[PDB]
């Protein structure tokens, strides 16, 4: 539990509860949409669109099967969509700590806008445009 709270420089303790509720909604959506006859194109089409939008959200960066929806969607996946982890893994800063130290005091820029929030999220297609000021 608090392993996740300490790995990714979470400024709070509430954020693990919130992302736990969102991932719970995704799992119960997966189970309810799972229990249909598998030739019903309702199930195929809606699980397909759920796959494609979860491609775009960067959570399932891995190209996926259906059964990954039970398997990989955790809190830590969406926590790896937080800004300084994108910053570190894009090899700008040196630690996650120092990335959060830079976003606390305004040197980081996504697009044309200043950022000062350590809970802004990035897509799989907005992270091309990250620079400094």
């Amino acid at each position: 539990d608090t392993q996740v709270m300490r790995t990714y420089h979470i400024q709070n303790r509430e954020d693990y509860h919130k992302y736990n509720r969102i991932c719970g909604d995704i799992r119960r959506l997966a189970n309810k949409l799972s229990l249909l006859p598998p030739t019903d194109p309702f199930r195929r089409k809606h699980e397909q669109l759920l796959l494609d939008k979860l491609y775009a959200m960067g959570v399932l960066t891995t190209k996926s099967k259906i059964s990954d929806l039970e398997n990989k969607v955790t809190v830590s996946a969406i926590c790896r969509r937080r800004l300084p982890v994108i910053m570190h893994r894009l090899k700008m800063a040196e630690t996650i700590q120092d990335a959060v130290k830079f976003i606390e005091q305004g040197h980081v820029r996504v697009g044309p806008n200043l950022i000062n929030d350590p809970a802004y999220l990035v897509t799989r297609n907005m992270e091309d445009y990250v620079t400094w000021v």
Binding site: I22, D25, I26, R28, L29, K32, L33, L36, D40, F42, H46, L50, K53, M57, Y120, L121, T123
Partner: peptide, 26 residues
Amino acid sequence: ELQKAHSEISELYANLVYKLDVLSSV
């Protein structure tokens, strides 16, 4: 039955699109 299941699943899908869309541009 089947139409009911399409009703509640289309409901939660419509809600879930909204909840991810809040995080989509913020």
